[PDB]
């Protein structure tokens, strides 16, 4: 029932976006993020961390990851970070909150960062 085993694979958000992630035995998250819209276009590299020895008292597993919105096809001069927890079981979820910062002048820094939320499931919407 390990968090390593549970997190590794493909997840889909409410908006249709696809997360493909491998959770390493010692806390690494690596993979890609594709489709719908943070500020997207094809696949982007994703990296993060998770608690590889979580509590076994029914608590979720803390994690986070980052995508910089630059690949071979697009550069949005922005990066998003998702912070959340994985909940296992038949109805598994990654529940997140997400910050998206765009590069700005000092003057526009006040409007540099968006906040949203993303819920990921194992099955498509």
UniProtKB/Swiss-Prot annotation:
Keyword Ion transport: no
Binding site for biotin: 33, 44, 82, 98, 110
Major place of residence: secreted
Subcellular location: Secreted
Recorded GO CC terms: extracellular region
Keywords linked to the UniProt accession: Biotin, Secreted, Signal
Superkingdom to which the source organism belongs: Bacteria
GO molecular function list: biotin binding
Similarity remark: Belongs to the avidin/streptavidin family.
Biological role: The biological function of streptavidin is not known. Forms a strong non-covalent specific complex with biotin (one molecule of biotin per subunit of streptavidin).
Subunit relationships: Homotetramer.
Name by which UniProt lists this protein: Streptavidin
Organism from which the protein derives: Streptomyces avidinii
Organism taxonomic ancestry: Bacteria, Bacillati, Actinomycetota, Actinomycetes, Kitasatosporales
């Amino acid at each position: 029932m390990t968090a390593e085993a549970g997190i590794t694979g493909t997840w889909y958000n409410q908006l249709g976006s696809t997360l493909i992630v491998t959770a390493g035995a010692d806390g690494a998250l690596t993979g890609t993020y594709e489709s719908a819209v943070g500020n997207a276009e094809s696949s982007y590299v994703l990296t993060g961390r998770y608690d590889s020895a979580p509590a076994t008292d029914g608590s979720g597993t803390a994690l986070g990851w980052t995508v910089a919105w630059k690949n071979n096809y697009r550069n949005a001069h922005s990066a998003s970070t998702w912070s959340g927890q994985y909940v296992g079981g038949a109805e598994a979820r990654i529940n997140t909150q997400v910050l998206t910062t765009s590069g700005t002048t000092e003057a526009n820094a006040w409007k540099s960062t968006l906040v949203g939320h993303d819920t990921f499931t194992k099955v498509k919407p």
